[PDB]
């Protein structure tokens, strides 16, 4: 999410 992948999140 944030249109990104990282911090264990999409
Ligand atoms: Ca969002």
User: How would a textbook summarize the main sheet?
Assistant: none
Helix content: under 10%
Estimated radius of gyration: 5 Å
Which range does the strand content fall in? under 5%
What is the helix tally? 0
Q: What structural class do helix, strand and pairing data support? A: little secondary structure
Distance between the termini: 4 Å
Shape: elongated
Question: How many E-type strands?
Answer: 0
Small ligands present: calcium ion
Quaternary state, please?
monomer
Describe this structure in words.
- With 10 residues, this protein is mostly loops.
- Helix content is 0%, strand content 0%.
- Bound molecules: calcium ion.
- The PDB classes it as de novo protein.
- The entry lists the keywords cyclic peptide, 2-fold symmetric, L and D-amino acids, DE novo protein.
- It forms a monomeric assembly.
- C2 symmetric peptide design number 1, Zappy, crystal form 2.
Summarize the structure.
By secondary structure, the protein is mostly loops.
Topology, please?
Blueprint (H helix, E strand, L loop, with lengths): L10
The structure holds calcium ion.
PDB class: de novo protein
Keywords: cyclic peptide, 2-fold symmetric, L and D-amino acids, DE novo protein
Assembly: monomeric
Key terms for this structure?
L and D-amino acids, monomer, 2-fold symmetric, de novo protein, little secondary structure, binds calcium ion, elongated, cyclic peptide, 10 residues
